[PDB]
């Protein structure tokens, strides 16, 4: 009867919005198309490095620091004679060196949301050249191939260590005196124990915020490795769109997802939300047991040693 005063003041306003917006996006999209058509422009040329190789070499970072290599940089190891030596980064400073890096995150430099084979062969930049110097004393973002990681552990009693740093600056650890990863044939099944640490045993006990059944589906110990094209997560369903790896954007021992997801997505700043994630999941460099599902680290790294 009187809803006739709207077409005068209510709508000529319930409409001005759409303008102030659909005008903005339409505009704020060109910026993007622009950034990209640019980065694509840059990429016509790849980034280069020159990592002259250090004389010293062994079966792995340990033997090496034992053979005299005392600087943290890139070394060349050959654990098993059945395979040819591959390059790897050795941490010879933190916790009495001998540390062989398996995984490292420190900037956005590398895409981790990759396929199965890649994770199996490894990818990323092992090390970049130290400012000036002729050796790559600086590590890069990478994931030493799965097969290599497997074999490294199936050699002898291997201990694992995981470090991470938040954006404000504080740190934490996650020791696992025992660590192993079966071969490809066995879906690189993980397995750990002896948790020394300050980050909270995510891999074995699961999130510190999920109760009962909800937590046990966050434990990684004994889990298989999953990638966005090879399912093996604890999530069992007919629905294909539901695979922890497709969501949580990465490749990792998923068990109906996670409690800790390194190799996740590298969100800058650390503070991130669901209405920000490509899939609305807590994908990202996260270790729940220390910052909750909504915080991607500024640095995350998995290094090994024998013991």
């Amino acid at each position: 009867l009187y809803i006739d005063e709207t077409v005068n003041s209510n709508i000529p306003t319930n409409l001005r919005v759409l303008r102030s917006i659909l005008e903005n996006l339409r505009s704020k999209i060109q910026k993007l198309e622009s950034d990209v058509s640019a980065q694509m422009e840059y990429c016509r040329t790849p980034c280069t490095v020159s990592c002259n190789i250090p004389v010293v070499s062994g079966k792995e970072c340990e033997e090496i620091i034992r053979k005299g290599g005392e600087t943290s940089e890139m070394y060349l190891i050959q654990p098993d004679s059945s395979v040819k030596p591959y390059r790897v980064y050795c941490d010879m400073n933190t916790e009495n060196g001998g540390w062989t890096v398996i995984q490292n995150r420190q900037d956005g430099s590398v895409d981790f949301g990759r396929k199965w084979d890649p994770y199996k062969q490894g990818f990323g930049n092992v090390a970049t050249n130290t400012d000036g110097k002729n050796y790559c004393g600086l590590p890069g973002e990478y994931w030493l191939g799965n097969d290599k990681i497997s074999q490294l552990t199936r050699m002898g009693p291997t201990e694992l260590l995981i470090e991470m740093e938040d954006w404000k600056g504080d740190k934490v650890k996650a020791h696992y005196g025992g660590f192993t990863v079966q071969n490809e044939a066995n879906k690189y099944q993980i397995s750990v124990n002896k948790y020394r640490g300050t980050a909270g045993n995510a891999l074995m006990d699961g999130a510190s915020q999920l109760m009962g059944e909800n937590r046990t589906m966050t434990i990684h110990n004994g889990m298989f490795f999953s990638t966005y094209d090879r399912d093996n997560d604890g999530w069992l369903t007919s629905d294909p769109r539901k695979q922890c790896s497709k969501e949580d954007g990465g490749g990792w021992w998923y068990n109906r997802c996670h409690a800790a997801n390194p190799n996740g997505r590298y969100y800058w700043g650390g503070q991130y939300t669901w209405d920000m994630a490509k899939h609305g999941t807590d994908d990202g460099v996260v270790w729940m047991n220390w910052k909750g599902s909504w915080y991607s680290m500024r640095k995350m790294s998995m290094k090994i040693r024998p013991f």
Binding site: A207, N214, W235, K242, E247, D248, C257, N261, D282, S293
Partner: peptide, 4 residues
Amino acid sequence: GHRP
């Protein structure tokens, strides 16, 4: 990440 947890799925109920």
